[PDB]
Amino acid sequence: CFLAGEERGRCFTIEYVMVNVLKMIRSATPFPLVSLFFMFIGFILSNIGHIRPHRTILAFVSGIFFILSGLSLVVGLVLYISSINDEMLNRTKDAETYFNYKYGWSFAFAAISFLLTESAGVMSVYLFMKRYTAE
Amino acid sequence: AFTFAAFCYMLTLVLCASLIFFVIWHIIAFDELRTDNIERICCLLRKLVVPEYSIHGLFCLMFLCAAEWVTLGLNIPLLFYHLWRYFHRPADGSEVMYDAVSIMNADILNYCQKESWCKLAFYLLSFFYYLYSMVYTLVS
Amino acid sequence: LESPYVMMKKNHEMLEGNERYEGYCVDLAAEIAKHCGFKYKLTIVGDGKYGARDADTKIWNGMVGELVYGKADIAIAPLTITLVREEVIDFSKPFMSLGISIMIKKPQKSKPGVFSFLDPLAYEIWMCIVFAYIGVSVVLFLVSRFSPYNEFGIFNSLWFSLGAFMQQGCDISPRSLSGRIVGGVWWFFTLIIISSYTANLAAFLTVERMVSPIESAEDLSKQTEIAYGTLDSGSTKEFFRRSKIAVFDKMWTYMRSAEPSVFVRTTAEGVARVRKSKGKYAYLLESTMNEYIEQRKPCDTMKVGGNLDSKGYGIATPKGSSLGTPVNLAVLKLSEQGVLDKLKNKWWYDKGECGAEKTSALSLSNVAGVFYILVGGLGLAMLVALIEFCYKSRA
Amino acid sequence: PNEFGIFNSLWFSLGAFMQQGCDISPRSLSGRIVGGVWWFFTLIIISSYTANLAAFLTVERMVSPIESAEDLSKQTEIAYGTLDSGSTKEFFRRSKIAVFDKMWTYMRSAEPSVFVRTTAEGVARV
Amino acid sequence: RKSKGKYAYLLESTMNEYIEQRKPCDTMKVGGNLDSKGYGIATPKGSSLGTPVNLAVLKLSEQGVLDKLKNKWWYDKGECGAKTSALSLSNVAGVFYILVGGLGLAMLVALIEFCYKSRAEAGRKALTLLSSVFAVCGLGLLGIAVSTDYWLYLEEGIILPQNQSTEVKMSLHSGLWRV
Amino acid sequence: SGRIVGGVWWFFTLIIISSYTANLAAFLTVERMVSPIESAEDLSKQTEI
Amino acid sequence: YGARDADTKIWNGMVGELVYGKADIAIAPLTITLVREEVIDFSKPFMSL
Numbered sequence A: 001c002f003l004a005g006e007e008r009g010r011c012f013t014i015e016y017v018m019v020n021v022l023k024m025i026r027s028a029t030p031f032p033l034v035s036l037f038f039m040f041i042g043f044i045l046s047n048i049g050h051i052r053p054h055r056t057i058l059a060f061v062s063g064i065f066f067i068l069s070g071l072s073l074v075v076g077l078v079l080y081i082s083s084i085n086d087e088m089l090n091r092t093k094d095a096e097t098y099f100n101y102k103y104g105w106s107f108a109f110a111a112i113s114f115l116l117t118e119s120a121g122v123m124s125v126y127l128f129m130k131r132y133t134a135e
Numbered sequence B: 001a002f003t004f005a006a007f008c009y010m011l012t013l014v015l016c017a018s019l020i021f022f023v024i025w026h027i028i029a030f031d032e033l034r035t036d037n038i039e040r041i042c043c044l045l046r047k048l049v050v051p052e053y054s055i056h057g058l059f060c061l062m063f064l065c066a067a068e069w070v071t072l073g074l075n076i077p078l079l080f081y082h083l084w085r086y087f088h089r090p091a092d093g094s095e096v097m098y099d100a101v102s103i104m105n106a107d108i109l110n111y112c113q114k115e116s117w118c119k120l121a122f123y124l125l126s127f128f129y130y131l132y133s134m135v136y137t138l139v140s
Numbered sequence C: 001l002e003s004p005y006v007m008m009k010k011n012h013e014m015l016e017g018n019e020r021y022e023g024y025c026v027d028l029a030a031e032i033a034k035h036c037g038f039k040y041k042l043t044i045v046g047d048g049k050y051g052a053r054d055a056d057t058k059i060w061n062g063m064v065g066e067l068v069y070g071k072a073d074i075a076i077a078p079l080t081i082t083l084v085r086e087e088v089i090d091f092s093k094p095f096m097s098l099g100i101s102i103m104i105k106k107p108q109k110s111k112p113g114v115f116s117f118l119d120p121l122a123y124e125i126w127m128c129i130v131f132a133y134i135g136v137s138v139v140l141f142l143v144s145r146f147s148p149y150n151e152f153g154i155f156n157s158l159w160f161s162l163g164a165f166m167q168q169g170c171d172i173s174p175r176s177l178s179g180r181i182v183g184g185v186w187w188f189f190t191l192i193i194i195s196s197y198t199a200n201l202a203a204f205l206t207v208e209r210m211v212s213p214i215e216s217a218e219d220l221s222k223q224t225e226i227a228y229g230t231l232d233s234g235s236t237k238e239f240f241r242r243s244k245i246a247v248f249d250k251m252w253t254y255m256r257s258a259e260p261s262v263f264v265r266t267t268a269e270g271v272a273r274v275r276k277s278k279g280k281y282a283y284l285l286e287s288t289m290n291e292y293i294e295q296r297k298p299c300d301t302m303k304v305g306g307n308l309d310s311k312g313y314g315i316a317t318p319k320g321s322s323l324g325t326p327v328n329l330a331v332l333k334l335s336e337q338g339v340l341d342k343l344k345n346k347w348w349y350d351k352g353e354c355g356a357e358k359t360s361a362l363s364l365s366n367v368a369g370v371f372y373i374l375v376g377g378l379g380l381a382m383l384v385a386l387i388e389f390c391y392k393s394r395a
Numbered sequence D: 001p002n003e004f005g006i007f008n009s010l011w012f013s014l015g016a017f018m019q020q021g022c023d024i025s026p027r028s029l030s031g032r033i034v035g036g037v038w039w040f041f042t043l044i045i046i047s048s049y050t051a052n053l054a055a056f057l058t059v060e061r062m063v064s065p066i067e068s069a070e071d072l073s074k075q076t077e078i079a080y081g082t083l084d085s086g087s088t089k090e091f092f093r094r095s096k097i098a099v100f101d102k103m104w105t106y107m108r109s110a111e112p113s114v115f116v117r118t119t120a121e122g123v124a125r126v
Numbered sequence E: 001r002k003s004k005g006k007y008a009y010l011l012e013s014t015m016n017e018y019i020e021q022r023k024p025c026d027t028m029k030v031g032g033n034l035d036s037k038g039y040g041i042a043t044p045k046g047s048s049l050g051t052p053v054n055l056a057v058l059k060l061s062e063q064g065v066l067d068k069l070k071n072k073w074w075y076d077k078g079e080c081g082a083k084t085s086a087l088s089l090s091n092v093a094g095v096f097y098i099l100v101g102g103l104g105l106a107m108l109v110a111l112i113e114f115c116y117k118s119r120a121e122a123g124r125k126a127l128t129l130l131s132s133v134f135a136v137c138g139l140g141l142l143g144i145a146v147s148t149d150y151w152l153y154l155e156e157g158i159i160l161p162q163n164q165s166t167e168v169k170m171s172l173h174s175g176l177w178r179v
Numbered sequence F: 001s002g003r004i005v006g007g008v009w010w011f012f013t014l015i016i017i018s019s020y021t022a023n024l025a026a027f028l029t030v031e032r033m034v035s036p037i038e039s040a041e042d043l044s045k046q047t048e049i
Numbered sequence G: 001y002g003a004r005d006a007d008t009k010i011w012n013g014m015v016g017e018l019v020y021g022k023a024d025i026a027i028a029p030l031t032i033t034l035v036r037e038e039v040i041d042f043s044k045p046f047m048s049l
């Protein structure tokens, strides 16, 4: 969504539209969706393990999907930023031009959500070892 | 000049000189078997089985990556010999594997004697061969 | 009108005469009129074409057409000495030697690879490290099990040598003279090899050294990655077509067939496609405008190699004149006195733009390979732990 | 098949990054791959910190200040300037000295103008 | 060819490309041309072949004969042909010799440890003699060293750039207090 | 007594290995700065050839 | 190749054999110069050097 230079409030959905590239982030694009899919599985499996605690394996296996969701967020954020940095690299050198990229508040949320699955994926393993030594 | 191929002939000379020692132990063990002992000769050979068949397995992966297709080929007849010798004739073991549960037969023992002199003859062939292509690649 | 030759001055509205026009062939025409002796009158051709014979009407098409009929007396212009023009007009000896040249984009840094961290050591070394790694771990095994003092299995001898290579020693160490020689020379290895990795990476990031992918036309000929391209109707495309030599045959059969069309319609568009390529398009141009567009903002282009043919620009007169012999002797005088060369440094290289380090931080792109090997190595170890759990517990 | 809690797994990996080997090490091939690729990570990252810092401190040490007109003659990233009347222009104009020829060559053809109209304006630009 | 990168002979382009493509392949050409000259077929002043030779040379330029005859003599009949930014196995190469020579040293020590300790399974007199012999030899060697003057050799001379051979001006076999 | 011998030997090797790494980095930088002759202007400055 | 001396003003060589009648044509590396163009007629350059 263009914001100040020719304030074109038309939000270009990049798939079919039309200077920058900004389809550089299509390689990065699957990995937050893969991680959100693995995390949503883990939320199903950790809740039903709390609903039925007569099984224990539902707790530890939900612990894996949280931790797999985190490793899909790292490769997400690494390949996101690595796709950025080699496009501010391919800019013809000049003293009348400046590029200033700056990450925003949805980049922080995917960064914070890394810390919360690695937290909950750790805590779903301690919940397993307490539940498995119970039965 | 020192290249990756030339390093592969150095390190295989270092290791096949430890392979000739595995088969000089293989001749001296069965020779003291017939002149005189089961569990002693059972143990000391089996711990020197999978070391022997895998250091040579290291060689076959070494000359592959060095793109030395000749010396890769000259170890192929021993590799599938080794591949048959572990997969077939396992007889039972139920441990690491090879060579010994209740041997005591002129069939199996001379077959171990067929090994003993052949493995020494093949590896001493390789040591002077590996020294040949090492010195060859270094000065070329 | 073509730069760095005659061009309209910035105040061409207010001025009049021989002062509206500036450039190489205004300074050249002033020097021809000094050594010959006359008063010149700069007259831009009405057609704006250099000169060519029309198909069947047989009337010429520009500056050649003005000299043949009556409309001019001399053409001090970038006019190529060809065969079909010498038959009608009389050229001087060349005031400028040139030819077909190669224009590329100025070689930038890279896009840093996904295994670009391996660059300070050659791939011959990184393989020698891996096989000396196993070769030491095998020797540390054999010498610890046979000839004991045990703890160094092949599982533990690979782990001791990994900690020794990765500069982080382990909670095992050999206790025999034989095992401590294996440890000691593998420790000397990893001191030198890792000091050589850091030092060569310090040499990289300090001295930045760009290379051109192609540096001749033969090195253009034996590739498939970078595309060629000339103008669609000129002496350049007609050069590669009727050539027979060795390489320009191969450089024609590529350009003839391979699509999207490498040919262009204007020099100004062909320079754009060099800059709209990030290094896959090489516009084959005539040597003098290639050195022009190199020295103009934005500085993005570069001439590589040497000229592909040799031709020349010459001052033309009509067939039979009292100017023809004095102008010819003027050009050879201005060549030896260095006037034609000091006017070359002026308009191409002095009356123009760009001239003759920063160490930005390492971006994530430079070391993005080890973040992929890490997570790929964490994903591989979660596979092995599942395989271990099945194999152990079920049996 | 522990000694590795999360408090001891977070501690093994500080000491693996900060290249200071800890008391405990993984004993399973599952854990000795996590230990292995984390060691290769920190081997590259610390070598890339040391050698980029060595590339900073070398290049800022190469930066030599202006100490002549010949040092101005080569380095055309610092712009010249001369008051736009009088004998300082007329020195560089009619000069036939090699350095001062190249200095007038830059100053006559440059945009925006290096030629200031007043001394107090030219000091202000410095 | 002899000065090892100290001398740069400024000559004609076509003699430079000849000598470059000529055995031994030792010299090369860098940069571009410094001026621009030309070779010409030359008629007396008023010859009949002033115009047909002029139209011949331009016809051979366009057909490519002058380039075909250029590739034949300078390059085809020329006895030649036609950096990687990284440490190779020639820079770090003694390291692989110390490593392999250390592994070969270690396994012959494992042979000696095996033979010495298998026959061990099957004193004060030694340390008394080994302490005294290594002392009196150490007393002997430093005693010789301090007195005798062959600590440092010192040769100062001049360069003679023909062969880059040298000639001494000074030579020492100095010592601790004796030149 | 022994933790001083251990201590000053560690400071020794800290300086020596940092001096090997950083002198090798001073070799490979300076040989990388060595640009060959590519013009007459490059001959014009470099009067060692 | 060809050069006039200031003393006798007589060319020596291939330029001398064209001016003083000995030759008809001089296919050779005869460099197109000013002082030669006034006495002989060079063609267009067959080689730029």
Ligand SMILES: CC(C)CCC[C@@H](C)[C@@H]1CC[C@H]2[C@@H]3CC=C4C[C@@H](O)CC[C@]4(C)[C@@H]3CC[C@@]21C
Pocket (backbone or CB within 6 Å): C177, C181, E105, E109, E112, E113, E116
């Ligand atoms: C670390 C490097 C320098 C290796 C040094 C070992 C050298 C000096 C040599 C190689 C043959 C060795 C021998 C090898 C092993 C035996 C048996 C052991 O019970 C004590 C050491 C002893 C008696 C020898 C000591 C030293 C020795 C003479």
Ligand SMILES: O=c1[nH]c2cc(C(F)(F)F)c(N3CCOCC3)cc2n(CP(=O)(O)O)c1=O
Pocket (backbone or CB within 6 Å): C002, C050, C051, C078, C079, C080, C233, C234, C235, C236, C267, C286, C288, C289
């Ligand atoms: O006599 C000729 N002299 C020419 C001189 C030049 C220039 F270099 F600009 F001086 C150019 N251009 C080349 C670059 O794009 C702009 C025009 C074309 C010329 N042409 C047409 P061509 O040679 O058939 O292509 C002639 O005919």
Ligand SMILES: O=c1[nH]c2cc(C(F)(F)F)c(N3CCOCC3)cc2n(CP(=O)(O)O)c1=O
Pocket (backbone or CB within 6 Å): D083, D085, D086, D087, D088, D119
């Ligand atoms: O005779 C001259 N004596 C000058 C003396 C001085 C001063 F130093 F201030 F005394 C100055 N300034 C220096 C800078 O501009 C403001 C005044 C100019 C002088 N000028 C003009 P010039 O042509 O620039 O030399 C003369 O002509």
